[PDB]
Symmetry: D2
């Protein structure tokens, strides 16, 4: 019932935590409809121009997004995502991704995620459309 819903919440949280662990992502701040997580770029994530590969950035943002869904028990997947890359993230940068619900409908939602560096400059903007 209620207890199945609670179980699903806890299950979605365990899964999100396992991906975060495996990516080296830490929760810094989290509350209703938002989450701020951090990650350090390591030399293992560099593309040929020595910056963070777009797929790690996309995961870091996906994980922040999952945590923002999960702050309110609203487990969802992304159905679409738009991303502006403004500056590269280099090895050793500490990247902070904030995700924030902007609209939550009956079946779908829109979430914005901003990734910034340790100089507080914007590395990337995402807007995602979610489903569930």
């Amino acid at each position: 019932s209620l207890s199945h819903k609670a179980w699903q919440n806890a299950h979605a949280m365990y899964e999100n935590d396992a991906c975060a662990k495996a990516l080296g992502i830490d929760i810094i701040s989290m509350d209703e409809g938002f989450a701020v997580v951090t990650m350090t770029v390591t030399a293992q994530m560099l593309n040929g121009h020595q910056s963070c590969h777009g797929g790690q950035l996309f995961s870091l943002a996906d994980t922040a997004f999952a945590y923002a869904c999960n702050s309110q028990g609203l487990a969802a997947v992304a159905s679409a995502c738009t991303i502006d890359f403004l500056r590269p993230g280099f090895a050793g940068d500490t990247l902070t991704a904030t995700a924030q619900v902007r609209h939550q409908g009956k079946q779908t939602g829109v979430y914005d995620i901003e990734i910034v560096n340790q100089q507080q400059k914007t590395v990337a903007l995402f807007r995602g459309k979610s489903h569930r």
Copy 2:
């Protein structure tokens, strides 16, 4: 010709692409403004629904995109892009990403990528915008 140059560029890039090699991406087709790459979904890449993670799918699309927009010999990177996820990728699924130039100016370009599984079903649609960053490729 243009296709031979496109493949030389792609061989140069792939030879030091550890993300592509780590994910098992192979390149199967190359022409100027055009690339087709391939990857098998292994269990390691799955979320809680036994479905491929977005970042792996994004990475596949971004790889066909990097090849297609670097194929003319001018180093270029993504400034922006959009992805629609249409169907899950399940373990064992073989996924083919095809990237095709829609516009290429002196500095900027637009490239459409489609990811299709072995049943010929669309998994995902991506559209990427590139920016040349100066000089020749890595």
Copy 3:
């Protein structure tokens, strides 16, 4: 029944035709899941830099899209749209918008629209996500 569905088709077509009329849009070619329509930019559509305003371009593309939905009886609205503007459309250009279904799900779809000028250069690319 069937005849209600047929009536709705014909009704959606009349509406799309009235918007096209009011925008000066002509059908050039149309078939299952695609439509190619044209429009001339008039001096009444210019912004301050003397090019077509983005909202006329958006309408021209919306109308091509409606006609592509309607080619197969699949009346829909756009829920999201992404647009790259590559070159302006100037007064007197004849702009051709092609719309093409790329995916059609149970409730939703994706359509691509390209607008080109009379020199066959690309003026704008749209990708739309549709609903119905």
Copy 4:
């Protein structure tokens, strides 16, 4: 100060903006990187569901966007953008589009626009990318 300059720019542009005037757009707030504009949905703008047309909604968002990204005094145009439609706009609805800078480099910028109706419900979310085209505004 910065806001006074922002409003001078906006008065200069609006004074010859016939699309804004034709659609009844008014400007109500201006600061550097920031603009709020307003419009009432009349019957003339409705589709077959008695709902505002996308192009009118797009035009409203693009107007707040043009104001916000021209507010620093450097002529700039949209190179790309994306819109999510969330709720219909019905006749009589008063719609407010607020545009806020997320990034502004020397040449390019990103601006987020939200359209809200008189019940404070979101109608639409738009994100636009701008490109400066040289010199001062029209």
